[PDB]
């Protein structure tokens, strides 16, 4: 059942569409809105899974493993809009550490060699000079520090151009700093380092050892690439939600109501009734028996919270756009082209127990963070069965305290216990590595462990299994990476390739947009962003794909915030938060987390902890 | 001035549109046809340049250098349609060797190491085991032979599945041979070698050392990739035209008439007048003062000789297509998607003299063929000022004769003389290397040698100069590749990036389609090809992009030949040739070339030559 006419139509039930709805309901009384979503699920590029494995330990019990098919981490600083969102939805009590290292034990596979992070530090970083035919100025330093030093040189040469480095910083950085008279957004990073005199060997080392080579090889420009590279310092304290990033959209859905959200309802095109001055949205819904329907309705205001690919599709097919003048239609198409599509993927393999601990490898145990490799892997992130004690031990560790032997010893048993509970690995890769897995996942039968109901009762709806080819090659690279003969067969598998599709012969449950976007070369994104708020009268665009903060949910909320500003008069949520609370969302979130971490620690770790 | 109405409208003045016109005029009396071309030049992806440098040797004389901005080589076997075309246009007297090696002196740059082909043979191919962390089964053999052996294994395991290996062979190969129960066109080559057990090191070696990595990393499927890899054996005797591949389209234009060809006339869209049963083609022409015009005309039969990208553009914007039923419109869009777009580029740098001969390097001289590298270069091909004696010496060399010292000694002076005349290098790269040059060519001022009229009188219309950034980095890689401190500044430069564009803010003289295409994964190209001959009634498609022989002009002529068959009753030109001549075009072209080579040799090389 679909309304006649709504005050605002919301196209897209990702984070951008949901956020708009909740803010207009709550902050603007607007209750005559509805959300139209083409998939059978809400939340878009945020997609968590919770598997209740059958406890089949010697001892009808269930053990839950959280995992991510999309978004996974966030930060307390630089995401004020997202922090305020958390604080206002009362979700901060679920916030849990996302750790990024294992004390140097994380894995590294390059040029047919498997080793650890601590290994790579040996001997003035000798191994890198041995695997890569580096220039003298490029030897004897840690790879990541090369990107670091280059950043510092860029800043030294642009004095014309700050403790917390947020989207303002990153927009001005790429739009105002230059190199050899050319500003950074007219540069590719690949051309940048080369022009700076780095060897091609060094440059391949950089994009292989950073796991995500699109920053170098894609058409994305150097300035936005840097924004991404300097988002993962050594001392990052990422956090996540215990039950997954889907906590946030689900929490938004409860507070919107499933009755204003219309699933399996793709908005096909939009015209504008010149008479009663209302947009007219042609759509296609599948009902619950699976029998299609094609309708149409009006709306005074239209909100498209859609990425680059979806927006071109509507633009092509909509009378509201075609009947625009040649110059403005072509100008507006042209500025759609100014953000580059970044494919991403994540393939999760669950195991009844974890085999990368010292008990199973005979090598120093791997715990948390990315295991990088120049194999199609890109990077590999371990995920563990949910467990309160473990998060407390992780919370103790975010504090760089000095445990006394009693507490150190208990942290040991905790660090080792997790290997006995179920767990999973994610292969998270980008640009260059995608095609390898593409062809793999679409060829041959799909993988299923035998007796797949004897462990795992419900299997979530959003889980498409990895192809048997994908598991096969993933199992061989894992042996390579973790330097062990022993990698068993997954209990469960999921594959998800965030790469937009233009083929009609693809089911809905397999159609997914481009995982991330990043500003293209030559793209003045100050003009692009502002021209895409209200490009037609009362028709708005918002979302991550053309934000200040590409690749992150904060990007979606800031881009939506401009829509809620220009079309509805709401100021930025972070500014709203401060006025109502007398302090920032950054400050409020830290104080709140400190208390829960403080508790969790005295409860499980050191009952005598003092901050 | 543009006709009311023609019997056949030809959209595209590349090789496919020109060939259709000439065959319908000549073989079918149809003279009420006209060609509509969006650019200011005929010929499409065939684009030769001829520069008359000012002879400024000590001694108003001009020295001409042929070069290629697109297509450059062909073969006497497997291109029967193209050979018959040559023989019927009387162009065989201009056919000249295109050599592919320099006796082992060609260059190789990999992992920061410059060396020669003869070097790589040393010591059971030792250098490859030293640059690449190869598996034991992958050491001690020449890289190219790995692709060779893998081919032979594929054939061994498919006995169900031939002296001259033409398009029939290659279609059946990829559509009927399988590996692990999956036919080759359901495979990527990357996944294929991996599943066969090759190391990732080995696989990076293969796609770097073959210069054109799209065969591995693009979405093209394994079978078509092989067709391309086994098109360059060791013993290839490529030939070209002395004045360039543009000889062929120009020769077609003379025999069509510039009066039936309409340049700067883009066909914008096509509808179908249901009344007088005629297609109706909306267009846009620029006149000779540069003032636009938008007209329209009819045609009984429409011939689109256009690649994948151009065909989608019309499909989107044409009432003849939109008003098709949902299922057939979406089916036909879907099968447009079944050939993968392969970007290509070629950047030519001309020099008053050649600096890679032993006189300028102190190293064994480089002569002909690809100098490969894992640098963004991809490959580098030397081009020399035209010179009759040189082609005779090259013709002597296609015969693997054994010169007596007199003749050997004269071939020496000839081999060395060319370094003193002007010459040029082409950087010919693909897939992964494109973006590097992209950003380079679009940033900063464009390169011009000072006093650029004091040598080079006319500069051809199709020459866009390389950006000053492109020359800068090209000059540094050349020093790397040719292992010399000394690489001077080009006298003239051209850049041309065969990568389709969707931006309106691009001039016409910079809009170029995708350089080549290759069959995607999952694409049964027997069905795709035949469904795209006459997809609407009396509206036809032909060209390279969906041919049996992607990447070559023979592909365009065979795909057009199906259009001339189904819509007009003409049999294949090669079959036509045989009936009229009593023998093949392969046989006739070899006998003709043998005679001219036989002459040329006795004239310049060994006046006592016996075949
Ligand atoms: C692999 C991956 C990992 C990530 N990790 C992180 C992370 O750790 N931290 C972080 O902060 N961010 C992360 N992100 C980014 C985050 O997922 C996004 O920034 C954000 O979720 C996208 O918000 P959006 O609403 O702009 O887009 P989306 O979430 O993609 O919303 C678009 C929605 O519109 C729907 N839609 C499309 N067309 C139509 C139509 N015609 N009619 C109706 N509905 C339509 C789509 O189905 C989808 O539901 C990650 C992204 C990916 C791909
Ligand atoms: C770098 C490179 C090197 C190559 N080397 C070789 C080689 O050595 N040997 C070989 O055999 N082949 C080679 N080829 C392949 C060869 O160039 C092509 O196979 C062939 O020339 C293309 O023929 P076509 O007519 O199918 O396409 P095109 O030549 O591309 O013809 C398309 C034409 O249609 C025009 N057009 C497009 N849209 C419209 C419109 N709306 N209205 C009007 N006109 C329009 C375009 O401007 C163009 O003129 C090479 C190709 C490239 C890119
Ligand atoms: N490459 C990107 O922009 C992805 C960033 C994303 N937030 C992540 O966790 O990886
Ligand atoms: N990669 C391709 O298909 C290009 C082939 C083309 N005939 C050439 O000379 O390179």
CSV table of N, CA and C in Angstrom, one decimal, chain A residues 26 126 143-144 199 208 254 377 436 478 508 573 579-580 597:
chain,number,residue,atom,x,y,z
A,26,UNK,N,11.2,14.6,13.7
A,26,UNK,CA,11.5,15.0,15.0
A,26,UNK,C,11.8,16.5,15.1
A,126,UNK,N,64.8,-3.8,7.0
A,126,UNK,CA,65.6,-4.3,5.9
A,126,UNK,C,64.7,-5.1,4.9
A,143,UNK,N,57.5,1.9,5.3
A,143,UNK,CA,56.7,2.4,4.2
A,143,UNK,C,55.6,3.4,4.5
A,144,UNK,N,54.8,3.2,5.5
A,144,UNK,CA,53.7,4.1,5.9
A,144,UNK,C,54.3,5.5,6.1
A,199,UNK,N,60.7,6.0,-6.8
A,199,UNK,CA,60.8,4.9,-7.8
A,199,UNK,C,59.5,4.2,-8.0
A,208,UNK,N,50.7,-1.6,-2.4
A,208,UNK,CA,50.4,-2.9,-2.0
A,208,UNK,C,50.4,-3.0,-0.5
A,254,UNK,N,13.2,2.0,13.9
A,254,UNK,CA,12.3,2.0,15.0
A,254,UNK,C,11.6,3.3,15.2
A,377,UNK,N,43.7,-10.9,-1.9
A,377,UNK,CA,43.3,-10.6,-0.6
A,377,UNK,C,43.2,-9.1,-0.3
A,436,UNK,N,39.5,-10.2,-9.9
A,436,UNK,CA,39.9,-11.5,-9.5
A,436,UNK,C,38.8,-12.2,-8.8
A,478,UNK,N,45.2,-17.8,2.5
A,478,UNK,CA,45.3,-17.8,4.0
A,478,UNK,C,46.5,-18.5,4.5
A,508,UNK,N,17.5,-8.9,-7.7
A,508,UNK,CA,17.6,-7.7,-6.8
A,508,UNK,C,18.5,-8.0,-5.7
A,573,UNK,N,23.2,19.0,12.8
A,573,UNK,CA,22.9,18.2,14.0
A,573,UNK,C,23.9,18.4,15.1
A,579,UNK,N,24.0,23.3,21.1
A,579,UNK,CA,23.0,24.2,21.7
A,579,UNK,C,22.1,23.6,22.7
A,580,UNK,N,21.6,22.4,22.5
A,580,UNK,CA,20.8,21.7,23.5
A,580,UNK,C,21.5,21.2,24.7
A,597,UNK,N,33.7,2.2,29.8
A,597,UNK,CA,34.9,1.5,29.8
A,597,UNK,C,35.5,1.3,31.2
